[PDB]
A paper describes a structure:
To further develop lyr- or bar-based marker genes with desired properties, we determined the three-dimensional structures of P. putida DSM84 Bar and P. mirabilis Lyr, which are the first structures for lysine-preferred racemases. All structures contain PLP, which confirms their PLP-dependent nature, and the positions of their catalytic lysines and tyrosines are similar to those in Alr structures.
In addition, the first liganded Bar-lysine structure was also established. The complex-Bar structure was established by co-crystallizing Bar with L-lysine. The apo and liganded Bar structures share the same two-domain architecture and are both composed of the AB-type dimer. The determined Bar-Lys complex structure also shows that the positive guanidium group of Arg261 (corresponding to Arg260 of Lyr) is close to the pyridine nitrogen atom of PLP, hence may not favor the formation of the quinonoid intermediate proposed in the classical two-base mechanism. Moreover, the carboxylate group of L-lysine is situated at a position, allowing hydrogen-bonding interactions with both catalytic bases, respectively. Moreover, structural comparison of complex-Bar structure and Bar-PLY docking model shows that the reactive intermediates (PLP-lysine) are situated at the comparable position and surrounded by identical residues to form resembling hydrogen-bonding networks, suggesting the feasibility of the docking approach utilized here.
Author numbering:
A (entry chain A), B (entry chain B): 26 to 409
The structure:
């Protein structure tokens, strides 16, 4: 959780960092490159890079997005925008959530295209562009797939009207329409798509604006890889980039490993308890590892008496409550674990693996919900 | 999360922050002044400032610590220490968890007193001081309340022996004995104190130790407040400083509020469902507020269709799965809610209140499990 950053770059080493997150530079390029070919010049790529690149370091990943000349980049937070631009990405850059107004105003300087899903929203945002002399480009979000989140519900006549006035805006230039698929099911994406289609068609036709000057973009990762017809003009892909997408497509390589150190290993007696509130009772006569990681560090409380790490290839049980900065793990079966070893909180360790599958199960929600904040709470460090 | 930062300083402002953590400098400055009094100058005070000050900004909490002549600070990570010193705090600086050697070593530059819990750990560490020409000051950790965590187990001769060789180390000034308590409970905390006493007595004796050179220091916050006799030479408080301690002690004030904005408000019709996986169906023609905060932001997935947030003092419910960046709430009952409105996700807003108790409920862990990380994934902004 570095306390000094210069556009995503810290001064930290693996040596002097307590727990760290390893972005694989290589897996990255292999993922970009693979998508780029699978897509096949039938579609463009926005690399979906919000959440600081899903906890991978927008600043760390920007090199490689530039490297594989990816044309487009989605962000969410204003900083993500500053950093992309400050990397020299002279390309298309779009926000993939609604902003707040003040926020959006600041953003103006970064020349980002802004998402709009409502006429009242549109209206204000317009007066903000007028105010600065600038012309602001906008993606119109359409609730085609049923998210009820960013975009206008073009299902009812009200929406269709709201949609019109979004385009009546004299200081906003319209340049896309979009929806985002809501269920990761083939059939359900397929309806979403059929809807997005009529609604685009409808709005294009009836607001006498023209195809040629818009990009229509609905496909997320799962959508791109599974319902390719849903590709259309451009796709925005987070997960797949980083190798958590459809578990079956194993050509998409994990980009992020989460790791800590072993502080030291202590002995304890039969009948001791471990961590707050005496949750675990020591069954035999034990050796424990003080691992320099906690919930402060990201490794959440919910892993209490449930989770496992890897050390020296060894699958090793988390024991007792997870303290704020220190994790306790039973090495009582593994005499070969020693001070300064390397803990793998998530990933593979020559032999072993902590599965995304098994961590999600413990957590109660998807893995992003953990790793996008592991990102925030530790140093991201480039590798391969 | 600011992507550029200096010692925990950022050019981020409530205007362009998408969500953010407000640290109340009076809530702080009060809380310290309160302890310092309640203590009566009869017992020394460490500001336990770990996890970047329990997610409050450590480089933020510092200038007040310095100005109130708090003599000691307790940090966890190396950066935390760098920043304490960067800030001009000059006095006693201990680490409250075993470090791993590489990390311990890097830290030598900051003059920190290091926690030590076993003979082997000690000798190793002796080695490093040795190599460096330094005399490292060490706090011995006892397992008196039986956390089984950093503390040498003194309930067993072998362990007892370990203690003794920890003290036989040539290159380490042993300068405290401490332990930490496992149950926030008047009785269990007492047993542990009584234990800790005989063990400190014993060590001082058998190791032939100048009592006037040791700090005997055991009490956390709860212990300090609820069990005076455990104050001994010094205490170690975080929660209290931040107003997250014994709910009953209301003289200690919350120093943190969690906050975000309304993106805009969309009319979605009955029958629509909200967010990934159709988790929620609209029983009525709704007005849904789009909030520029999400699980990547720290506001985690556990709150799907569970949470409440305040706008204009209104208890408004989370609807649909908390997405990565945006959060959807139901303002159909609350037409005062417009775009741009400030949102409390945790705290108080004119007359309403999002209680620690009600969030812990849904989380399943103490509030620190959430908010130490809110700290990390959001900019912290000083107030009052
Ligand atoms: C509007 C939008 N466009 C593109 C993407 C990229 O999708 P992908 O990562 O699934 O390829 C997202 C992901 N944001 C999701 C994360 C979905 C979790 C799956 N990785 C959210 O808001 O929760 C998105 O919200
Ligand atoms: C060794 C030690 N000493 C003192 C404290 C300060 O406790 P206080 O916050 O009650 O003043 C801690 C905090 N670490 C704990 C406390 C949780 C914070 C909730 N109060 C942990 O690792 O969960 C600690 O690990």
């Amino acid at each position: 959780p570095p306390l000094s950053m210069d556009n995503g770059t810290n001064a930290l080493t693996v040596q002097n960092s307590n727990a760290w997150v390893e972005v694989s530079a290589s897996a990255l390029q292999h993922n970009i490159r693979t998508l780029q070919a699978e897509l096949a010049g039938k579609s463009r790529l926005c690399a979906v890079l919000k959440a600081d690149a899903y906890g991978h370091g927008i600043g760390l990943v920007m090199p490689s997005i530039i490297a594989q000349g990816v044309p487009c980049v989605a962000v969410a937070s204003n900083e993500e925008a500053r950093v992309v631009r400050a990397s020299g990405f002279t390309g298309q850059l779009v926000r993939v959530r609604l902003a707040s107004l003040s926020e959006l105003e600041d953003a103006l300087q970064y020349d980002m295209e802004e998402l709009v899903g409502s006429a009242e929203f549109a209206r204000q945002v317009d007066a903000i562009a007028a105010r600065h002399g600038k012309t602001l480009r906008i993606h119109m979000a359409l609730n085609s797939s049923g998210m009820s989140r960013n975009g206008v519900e073009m299902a009812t006549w009200s929406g269709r009207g709201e949609a019109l006035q979004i385009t009546d805006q004299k200081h906003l230039k319209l340049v896309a329409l979009m929806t985002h698929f809501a269920v990761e099911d083939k059939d359900d994406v397929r309806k979403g798509l059929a809807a997005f289609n009529e609604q685009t068609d409808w709005l294009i036709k009836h607001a006498k604006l023209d195809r040629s000057k818009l990009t229509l973009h609905a496909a997320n990762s799962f959508a791109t890889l599974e319902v390719p017809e849903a590709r259309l003009d451009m796709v925005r892909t987070g997960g797949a980039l980083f190798g958590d997408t459809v578990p079956a497509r194993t050509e998409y390589q994990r980009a992020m490993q989460f790791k800590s150190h072993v502080a030291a290993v202590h002995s304890y007696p039969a009948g001791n308890t471990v961590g707050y509130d005496r949750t675990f009772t020591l069954a035999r006569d034990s050796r424990l590892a003080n691992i320099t990681v906690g919930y402060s560090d990201g490794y959440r409380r919910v892993f209490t008496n449930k989770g496992h790490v890897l050390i020296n290839g060894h699958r090793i049980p988390v024991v007792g409550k997870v303290s704020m900065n220190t994790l306790m793990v039973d090495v009582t079966d593994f005499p070969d674990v020693k001070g300064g070893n390397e803990v793998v909180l998530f990933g593979k360790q020559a032999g072993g693996e902590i599965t995304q599958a098994e961590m999600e199960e413990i957590n109660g929600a998807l893995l992003a919900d953990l790793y996008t904040v592991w990102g925030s709470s530790n140093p991201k460090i480039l590798v391969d």
